[model samples]
Target: MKVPPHSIEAEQSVLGGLMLDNERWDDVAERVVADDFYTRPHRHIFTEMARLQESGSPIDLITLAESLERQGQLDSVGGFAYLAELSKNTPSAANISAYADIVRERAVVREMIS
Candidate 1:
Protein backbone atom coordinates (compact mmCIF):
# COMPACT_ATOMS: atom_id res chain seq x y z
CA MET A 1 0.00 0.00 0.00
CA LYS A 2 2.99 2.30 0.19
CA VAL A 3 4.26 4.25 -2.75
CA PRO A 4 7.79 3.67 -3.89
CA PRO A 5 10.44 6.21 -2.98
CA HIS A 6 11.70 8.44 -5.79
CA SER A 7 12.45 12.05 -6.53
CA ILE A 8 11.37 13.21 -9.96
CA GLU A 9 12.53 16.76 -9.38
CA ALA A 10 15.94 15.62 -8.25
CA GLU A 11 16.19 13.35 -11.28
CA GLN A 12 15.28 16.25 -13.55
CA SER A 13 17.83 18.47 -11.91
CA VAL A 14 20.55 15.85 -12.27
CA LEU A 15 19.84 15.34 -15.95
CA GLY A 16 19.23 19.00 -16.58
CA GLY A 17 22.42 19.92 -14.81
CA LEU A 18 24.47 17.65 -17.03
CA MET A 19 22.94 19.23 -20.12
CA LEU A 20 23.27 22.69 -18.66
CA ASP A 21 27.00 22.11 -18.29
CA ASN A 22 28.52 19.01 -19.70
CA GLU A 23 31.67 19.47 -17.65
CA ARG A 24 29.63 18.33 -14.66
CA TRP A 25 29.27 14.95 -16.33
CA ASP A 26 32.38 13.62 -14.65
CA ASP A 27 31.04 14.39 -11.20
CA VAL A 28 27.45 13.46 -11.92
CA ALA A 29 28.48 10.27 -13.60
CA GLU A 30 30.43 9.27 -10.53
CA ARG A 31 27.39 9.94 -8.40
CA VAL A 32 24.47 8.36 -10.21
CA VAL A 33 23.54 5.88 -12.92
CA ALA A 34 20.74 5.67 -15.48
CA ASP A 35 18.88 3.07 -13.43
CA ASP A 36 18.58 5.59 -10.64
CA PHE A 37 16.03 7.55 -12.62
CA TYR A 38 12.39 6.83 -11.79
CA THR A 39 10.80 7.93 -15.03
CA ARG A 40 11.26 5.76 -18.10
CA PRO A 41 12.20 8.62 -20.40
CA HIS A 42 14.56 9.95 -17.79
CA ARG A 43 16.39 6.62 -17.65
CA HIS A 44 16.80 6.49 -21.42
CA ILE A 45 17.87 10.11 -21.59
CA PHE A 46 20.39 9.68 -18.80
CA THR A 47 21.77 6.58 -20.48
CA GLU A 48 22.46 8.52 -23.65
CA MET A 49 24.03 11.28 -21.63
CA ALA A 50 26.42 8.80 -20.06
CA ARG A 51 27.06 7.25 -23.44
CA LEU A 52 27.91 10.63 -24.94
CA GLN A 53 30.20 11.45 -22.05
CA GLU A 54 32.00 8.09 -22.23
CA SER A 55 32.60 8.61 -25.95
CA GLY A 56 34.37 11.90 -25.21
CA SER A 57 31.59 13.69 -27.04
CA PRO A 58 29.87 16.81 -25.82
CA ILE A 59 26.47 16.58 -24.16
CA ASP A 60 24.16 19.20 -25.52
CA LEU A 61 20.71 19.40 -27.01
CA ILE A 62 21.97 18.74 -30.53
CA THR A 63 24.40 15.96 -29.60
CA LEU A 64 21.89 14.34 -27.22
CA ALA A 65 19.16 14.50 -29.82
CA GLU A 66 21.47 12.97 -32.38
CA SER A 67 22.43 10.19 -30.04
CA LEU A 68 18.82 9.42 -29.18
CA GLU A 69 17.92 9.73 -32.83
CA ARG A 70 20.49 7.09 -33.62
CA GLN A 71 18.91 4.88 -31.04
CA GLY A 72 15.47 5.64 -32.51
CA GLN A 73 14.35 7.05 -29.15
CA LEU A 74 14.16 10.75 -29.88
CA ASP A 75 10.38 10.93 -30.03
CA SER A 76 9.83 8.37 -27.32
CA VAL A 77 11.73 10.52 -24.85
CA GLY A 78 9.73 13.66 -25.80
CA GLY A 79 12.18 14.92 -28.44
CA PHE A 80 14.25 18.10 -28.52
CA ALA A 81 11.53 20.16 -26.93
CA TYR A 82 11.77 18.21 -23.69
CA LEU A 83 15.52 18.45 -23.89
CA ALA A 84 15.20 22.19 -24.20
CA GLU A 85 12.81 22.24 -21.28
CA LEU A 86 15.36 20.56 -19.07
CA SER A 87 18.09 22.97 -20.08
CA LYS A 88 15.90 26.02 -19.66
CA ASN A 89 14.32 24.96 -16.38
CA THR A 90 17.44 23.98 -14.56
CA PRO A 91 18.46 26.86 -12.30
CA SER A 92 22.11 25.93 -11.93
CA ALA A 93 24.57 23.17 -12.74
CA ALA A 94 26.45 23.91 -9.53
CA ASN A 95 23.70 22.25 -7.51
CA ILE A 96 23.89 19.08 -9.54
CA SER A 97 26.10 17.23 -7.07
CA ALA A 98 23.56 17.62 -4.31
CA TYR A 99 20.76 16.82 -6.73
CA ALA A 100 22.51 13.68 -7.78
CA ASP A 101 22.81 12.66 -4.15
CA ILE A 102 19.07 13.05 -3.65
CA VAL A 103 18.26 11.05 -6.75
CA ARG A 104 20.69 8.30 -5.81
CA GLU A 105 19.29 8.19 -2.32
CA ARG A 106 15.75 7.82 -3.55
CA ALA A 107 16.78 5.01 -5.84
CA VAL A 108 18.51 3.31 -2.96
CA VAL A 109 15.37 3.52 -0.84
CA ARG A 110 13.25 2.20 -3.69
CA GLU A 111 15.62 -0.70 -4.16
CA MET A 112 15.66 -1.51 -0.50
CA ILE A 113 11.89 -1.66 -0.39
CA SER A 114 11.62 -3.63 -3.56
Candidate 2:
Protein backbone atom coordinates (compact mmCIF):
# COMPACT_ATOMS: atom_id res chain seq x y z
CA MET A 1 0.00 0.00 0.00
CA LYS A 2 1.14 3.54 -0.67
CA VAL A 3 1.83 5.46 2.50
CA PRO A 4 0.29 8.85 3.08
CA PRO A 5 2.60 11.85 3.13
CA HIS A 6 3.92 12.72 6.55
CA SER A 7 7.16 13.62 8.29
CA ILE A 8 7.64 12.75 11.95
CA GLU A 9 11.11 14.29 11.99
CA ALA A 10 9.79 17.54 10.58
CA GLU A 11 6.96 17.49 13.06
CA GLN A 12 9.44 16.89 15.88
CA SER A 13 11.64 19.68 14.63
CA VAL A 14 8.74 22.07 14.48
CA LEU A 15 7.59 21.16 17.94
CA GLY A 16 11.20 21.13 19.09
CA GLY A 17 11.62 24.56 17.58
CA LEU A 18 8.71 25.86 19.57
CA MET A 19 9.83 24.16 22.74
CA LEU A 20 13.47 24.99 22.16
CA ASP A 21 13.20 28.72 21.85
CA ASN A 22 10.41 30.93 23.11
CA GLU A 23 11.43 34.05 21.17
CA ARG A 24 10.82 32.23 17.90
CA TRP A 25 7.19 31.52 18.59
CA ASP A 26 5.99 34.40 16.44
CA ASP A 27 8.47 33.39 13.78
CA VAL A 28 7.22 29.81 13.67
CA ALA A 29 3.70 31.10 14.20
CA GLU A 30 3.67 32.82 10.83
CA ARG A 31 4.65 29.62 9.07
CA VAL A 32 2.13 27.15 10.38
CA VAL A 33 -1.30 26.32 11.71
CA ALA A 34 -2.32 23.50 14.02
CA ASP A 35 -3.43 21.24 11.19
CA ASP A 36 -0.02 21.50 9.55
CA PHE A 37 0.83 18.45 11.63
CA TYR A 38 -0.51 15.01 10.76
CA THR A 39 0.10 13.65 14.24
CA ARG A 40 -2.78 14.13 16.64
CA PRO A 41 -0.50 14.84 19.59
CA HIS A 42 1.37 17.42 17.59
CA ARG A 43 -1.91 18.95 16.50
CA HIS A 44 -3.01 19.32 20.10
CA ILE A 45 0.33 20.79 21.19
CA PHE A 46 0.30 23.27 18.34
CA THR A 47 -3.27 24.25 19.16
CA GLU A 48 -2.33 24.88 22.77
CA MET A 49 0.64 26.96 21.69
CA ALA A 50 -1.58 29.01 19.41
CA ARG A 51 -3.98 29.58 22.25
CA LEU A 52 -1.07 30.69 24.43
CA GLN A 53 0.16 32.97 21.67
CA GLU A 54 -3.26 34.55 21.32
CA SER A 55 -3.40 35.12 25.05
CA GLY A 56 -0.06 36.95 25.18
CA SER A 57 1.36 34.31 27.44
CA PRO A 58 4.98 33.18 27.44
CA ILE A 59 5.75 29.92 25.69
CA ASP A 60 8.09 27.98 27.94
CA LEU A 61 8.09 24.30 28.74
CA ILE A 62 6.37 24.84 32.09
CA THR A 63 3.82 27.17 30.60
CA LEU A 64 3.22 24.84 27.68
CA ALA A 65 2.61 21.89 29.97
CA GLU A 66 0.17 23.99 31.94
CA SER A 67 -1.46 25.20 28.78
CA LEU A 68 -1.95 21.65 27.71
CA GLU A 69 -3.41 20.88 31.11
CA ARG A 70 -5.83 23.80 30.92
CA GLN A 71 -6.96 22.51 27.56
CA GLY A 72 -7.37 19.01 29.04
CA GLN A 73 -4.60 17.85 26.77
CA LEU A 74 -1.64 17.19 29.05
CA ASP A 75 -1.94 13.44 29.08
CA SER A 76 -3.30 13.26 25.59
CA VAL A 77 -0.38 15.29 24.29
CA GLY A 78 1.92 12.76 25.93
CA GLY A 79 2.46 14.53 29.24
CA PHE A 80 5.59 16.06 30.79
CA ALA A 81 8.10 13.52 29.55
CA TYR A 82 7.33 14.16 25.91
CA LEU A 83 7.22 17.88 26.48
CA ALA A 84 10.70 17.85 28.03
CA GLU A 85 12.04 15.63 25.28
CA LEU A 86 10.82 18.06 22.66
CA SER A 87 12.55 20.95 24.37
CA LYS A 88 15.74 19.31 25.53
CA ASN A 89 16.45 17.27 22.43
CA THR A 90 16.14 19.89 19.71
CA PRO A 91 19.25 20.51 17.62
CA SER A 92 18.27 23.95 16.43
CA ALA A 93 15.62 26.60 16.57
CA ALA A 94 17.35 28.31 13.65
CA ASN A 95 15.76 25.95 11.15
CA ILE A 96 12.25 26.27 12.53
CA SER A 97 10.89 27.92 9.41
CA ALA A 98 12.27 25.15 7.25
CA TYR A 99 10.67 22.56 9.47
CA ALA A 100 7.43 24.48 9.25
CA ASP A 101 7.66 24.49 5.48
CA ILE A 102 8.18 20.74 5.30
CA VAL A 103 5.30 20.16 7.69
CA ARG A 104 3.08 22.48 5.68
CA GLU A 105 3.96 20.71 2.46
CA ARG A 106 3.09 17.34 3.93
CA ALA A 107 -0.13 18.68 5.38
CA VAL A 108 -1.14 19.84 1.92
CA VAL A 109 -0.38 16.38 0.60
CA ARG A 110 -2.47 14.83 3.33
CA GLU A 111 -5.34 17.07 2.34
CA MET A 112 -4.95 16.09 -1.30
CA ILE A 113 -5.08 12.39 -0.44
CA SER A 114 -8.04 12.73 1.87
Which number leads on lDDT?
1
Q: What is candidate 2's local distance difference test score?
A: 0.82
Q: Candidate 1: lDDT over CA atoms?
A: 0.84
Query: Which residue window of length 10 is worst by lDDT in model 1?
Result: 83-92
How close to the true structure is residue 24 of candidate 1, measured as C-alpha lDDT?
87
- Residue-level lDDT of model 1, residues 35-61, one tens digit each, is 888889889889898888789898876
Q: Each model's C-alpha lDDT?
A: 0.84, 0.82
**Residue 1 displacement in candidate 2 (angstroms):** 0.8
Per candidate, the number of residue pairs that clash is 0, 0
Point out the worst 10-residue segment of candidate 2 by lDDT. Answer: 85-94
Q: List the residue pairs that clash in candidate 2.
A: none
lDDT of each residue in 1-114, candidate 2, tens digit only:
888868777778788888888777777777778878879988888888888889998777889899998878799978999888788656778788888888888878878874
In model 1, residue pairs whose N, Cα or C atoms come closer than 3 Å (at least 3 residues apart or on different chains), thus clashing, are none
> What's each prediction's TM-score?
0.91, 0.90
